Amino acid sequence: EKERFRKAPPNYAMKKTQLLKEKAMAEDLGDQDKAKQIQDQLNELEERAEALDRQRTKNISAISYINQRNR
Amino acid sequence: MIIPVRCFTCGKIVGNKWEAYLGLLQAEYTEGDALDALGLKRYCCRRMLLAHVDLIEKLLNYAPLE
Amino acid sequence: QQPMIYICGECHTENEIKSRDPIRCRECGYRIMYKKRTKRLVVFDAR
Amino acid sequence: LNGLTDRDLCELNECPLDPGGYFIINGSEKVLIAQEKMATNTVYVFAKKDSKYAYTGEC
Amino acid sequence: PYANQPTVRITELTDENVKFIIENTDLAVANSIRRVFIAEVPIIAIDWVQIDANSSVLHDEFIAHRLGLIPLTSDDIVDKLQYSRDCTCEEFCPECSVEFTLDVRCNEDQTRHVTSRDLISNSPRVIPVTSRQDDILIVKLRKGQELRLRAYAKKGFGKEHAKWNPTAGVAFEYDPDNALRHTVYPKPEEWPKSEYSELDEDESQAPYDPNGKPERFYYNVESCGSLRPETIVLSALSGLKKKLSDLQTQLSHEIQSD
Amino acid sequence: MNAPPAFESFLLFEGEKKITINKDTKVPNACLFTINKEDHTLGNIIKSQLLKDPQVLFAGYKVPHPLEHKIIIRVQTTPDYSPQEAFTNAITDLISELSLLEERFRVAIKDKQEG
Ligand SMILES: [Zn+2]
Ligand SMILES: [Zn+2]
Ligand SMILES: [Zn+2]
């Protein structure tokens, strides 16, 4: 009942949710179900990337920039 | 894992320079020039900015919540 | 009146687990959970 | 963790630096040491002296 | 059968280090003053940290360790406070200690840089080196973590621990030209000239001098930021004088008792 | 686990004397001064100051063991000059020299600032 209304991505199960979606898409032989699962996985990946960018906007990104320019 | 507060050998504060060192290296300066631009004369204090490995970032990647 | 609060594994959500009860989170449902820091006088000497 | 980005690895309480390739039995990292032996289907002609034979064609 | 009349001359006075020269004194006195500069110099520092909630990634003791190395300015407070060991009360009294507090919790999405600026001190003059140049980075927090604690500072000297070591590095040097032959160079031409060397670029080292005592000791006391350099020198001289006075008093009592 | 604390290097323990005099028996007018909770800082200057005095025939300290905080100073003067007064005079003149050095350094500093 809690997970019914509570949306899935929050918060640490992003990787687990993506793996479950990928497994469901692989298991489902249908076309519409596979497309929907693929779209959901892509949306989850984009959301995770945006969240990481927001969190890694400073320091975590500048360090990568300095490392690449130094190499 | 994190930049120390003072140089083991000398004792000069070096903790308040890691961010400045990264900024100077990013802008245009090189290492050999940035070190003396920050004010590090003795070679004992220069290892803290050259040898130090910044592992706190990888640790922060494992955020507990959200 | 201390029900031995715990912290979930992945949810990091507080849970009240008492004796003779299964070890699971109030939501989702996992099997891993850690304890909370003691309430004692944790005093160190910056030496 | 087959071809998984470092993001998920970090989110799954793992690191991308772990070489991997080790079994997990009862929560213990088990590794298989590569044992070496004599190559099969190859003829070896030794000369054991502490015996009655001058030469031995093992295969 | 008495002491000597040393002379002093400052060559460079700044707010980070001093280069003075001491002439007409024995080597033992110079070396002793150096060792006092490093070890026996009263200064305030963090020595009692009470951590209430530390959700950071580092160890619980790591925070206390880093806080112990953060210098604290004590230009006019170290001389007033008394050693906690010799206090005549209970709990860290403000008359013999200085209280600190740190309460930071990363709420926004970006990562926090908990610097020394977060140490909110109760006293105005006892603050980390942030008056007048980044601040000493303590730890890095991420969204969801926190670091609440309060610590107290007390007076101590380097002989007890390195936290009470004001001087960064003392450059003690005497007799730049190897005149007293205290060191024998196998190949003098291969060595560079000292900064204080008066010898020309032709000759490698000054000639031998049989009847010659060490004088003209050069100093380069470099303050870490807590105490001013000249203040470090004055405190060291006063402390050494106090140690000699106490030793003399004890000796007089011992002789009288016999 | 058995590491000694850091206060046992300078702080006196209950019952331990800061200084003890002990006369030697091998030669006349020779006493060994044993100091507790001190290091080379407080013995080398005294050794040199005694060396300056011509009436002191012998003067030198040591550290019985680095981990132990203790130093023994052996002094031997001429028969008409006891070593106790020699030690007292060495300390007195050394203190005077340090005070004068402090005053000169202070005046030099105050003149250096804008002058
Ligand atoms: Zn150094
Ligand atoms: Zn659960
Ligand atoms: Zn008090």
**What does the block give as tokens for E66?**
């880093």
* Spatial contact of C23 and C17, defined as CB atoms under 8 Å apart: yes
Q: How many CA atoms lie within 13 A of E41 on its CB side?
A: 34
Q: Across the beta sheet with E7-13, what order do the strands follow? A: E7-13, E18-23, E217-218, E173-174
Nearest-Cα distance to chain E for A22, in Å, is 28
Q: What is the full DSSP assignment across F60-76?
A: EEE-S-TTS-EEEEEEE
Residue type, E199: L
Dist CA C15 CA C23 (whole Å)? 10
Q: How many CA atoms lie within 13 A of E94 on its CB side?
A: 7
Q: Which domain holds residue C34?
A: 4-47
Nearest-Cα distance to chain A for C38, in Å, is 25
> What's the 3-state SS for chain B?
CCCCCECCCCCCECHHHHHHHHHHHHHCCCHHHHHHHHCCCCHHHHHHHHCCCCCHHHHHHCCCCC
Contacts with C22 (C-beta within 8 Å, 6 or more apart), sequence order? none
Q: How many CA atoms lie within 13 A of B38 on its CB side?
A: 28
Nearest partner of E150 among C39, C36, C42, judged by Cα: C42
Nearest partner of E114 among E70, E168, E152, judged by Cα: E70
Task: Tell me which ligand sits closest to the C-alpha of residue C33.
Answer: 2
Q: How many CA atoms lie within 13 A of D8 on its CB side?
A: 16
C27 labelled binding-site residue: yes
Best residue in E155, E240, E245 to probe F by mutation, most F CBs within 10 Å? Answer: E240
Dist CA E42 CA E212 (whole Å)? 36
Question: What three-state secondary structure class fits A39?
Answer: helix
* Spatial contact of E215 and E25, defined as CB atoms under 8 Å apart: yes
Dist CA D14 CA D8 (whole Å)? 8
Residue C46's CATH number? 2.20.28.30
User: Going from the N-terminus, what domains does chain E have, and what CATH number goes with each?
Assistant: 1-42+163-258 (3.30.1360.10), 43-162 (2.170.120.12)
Burial of D19 (0-12, 13-18, 19+ CB in 10 A): exposed
CB neighbours (10 Å) of residue B62? 14
Does the CB of B65 have a partner CB in chain A at under 8 Å?
A: yes
Q: Which of A12, A16, A52 sits opposite D7 (nearest CB)?
A: A52
Check residue F8 and report its DSSP letter.
G
Contacts with D18 (C-beta within 8 Å, 6 or more apart), sequence order? none
Give the bridge partners for E21, in sequence order: E9, E218
Dist CA D42 CA B59 (whole Å)? 53
Total domain count, chain F: 1
Nearest-Cα distance to chain D for A12, in Å, is 7
CB neighbours (10 Å) of residue F34? 16
* Spatial contact of C37 and E53, defined as CB atoms under 8 Å apart: yes
Best residue in E109, E113, E115, E140 to probe A by mutation, most A CBs within 10 Å? Answer: E109
Dist CA E222 CA E168 (whole Å)? 5
Q: How many CA atoms lie within 13 A of A63 on its CB side?
A: 12
Helix (H) / strand (E) containing A67: helix A60-70
Q: Which of B5, B59, B60 sits opposite E136 (nearest CB)?
A: B5
Dist CA D44 CA D22 (whole Å)? 35
Binding residues of E for Zn(2+): 87, 89, 93, 95-96
* Spatial contact of E231 and E221, defined as CB atoms under 8 Å apart: no
Distant-in-sequence contacts of E207-212, Cβ < 8 A, 24+ apart:
E207/E179, E208/E179, E208/E181, E209/E179, E209/E180, E212/E179, E212/E180
Dist CA B4 CA B18 (whole Å)? 9
Nearest partner of E230 among E27, E80, E39, E41, judged by Cα: E41
Dist CA E86 CA F11 (whole Å)? 11
> C9-26: string of b/e by CB count within 10 Å (b at 16+)?
bbbbbebeeeeeeeebbe
Question: What three-state secondary structure class fits C10?
Answer: coil
Tell me whether strands E146-156 and E120-121 are parallel, antiparallel or unpaired. Answer: unpaired
* Spatial contact of F84 and E255, defined as CB atoms under 8 Å apart: yes
Binding residues of E: 87, 89, 93, 95-96
CB neighbours (10 Å) of residue F7? 14
* Spatial contact of E6 and E209, defined as CB atoms under 8 Å apart: no
Does the CB of C7 have a partner CB in chain A at under 8 Å?
A: no
Q: Which position has the token pair 């200690």?
A: E97
Tell me whether strands E173-174 and E137-141 are parallel, antiparallel or unpaired. Answer: unpaired
B45 labelled binding-site residue: yes
Architecture per CATH, domain B1-66, reads as Orthogonal Bundle (1.10)
Tell me which chain A residues have a C-beta less than 8 angstroms from the C-beta of D7: 15, 48-49, 52
Nearest-Cα distance to chain D for A2, in Å, is 23
Question: What three-state secondary structure class fits A1?
Answer: coil
φ, ψ for residue D21, nearest 5 deg: 65, 45
* Elucidated via: cryo-EM
Resolution (in Å) of the shown entry?
Answer: 2.9
* Spatial contact of B59 and E59, defined as CB atoms under 8 Å apart: no
Q: What is the full DSSP assignment across chain E?
A: ------EEEEEEE-SSBEEEEEES--HHHHHHHHHHHHSS--EEEEEEEEEEEE-SSS-HHHHHHHHHT--B--TTTTTTS--GGG-SSSS--GGG-EEEEEEEE--SSSPEEEEGGG-EESSSS--BS-------EEEEE-TT-EEEEEEEEEEE-TTT-GGG--BS----EE-SS--S-SS--SSGGGSPPPTT--S-SS-SSPPP-SS-----EE---BB-SSS-HHHHHHHHHHHHHHHHHHHHHHHHHHHHH-
Question: What three-state secondary structure class fits F103?
Answer: helix
**What does the block give as tokens for E129?**
């080196």
Contacts with C30 (C-beta within 8 Å, 6 or more apart), sequence order? C8, C9, C10, C11, C24
Total domain count, chain C: 1
* Spatial contact of F82 and F29, defined as CB atoms under 8 Å apart: yes
Please answer yes or no on whether C28 and A3 come within 8 Å at the CB atom: yes
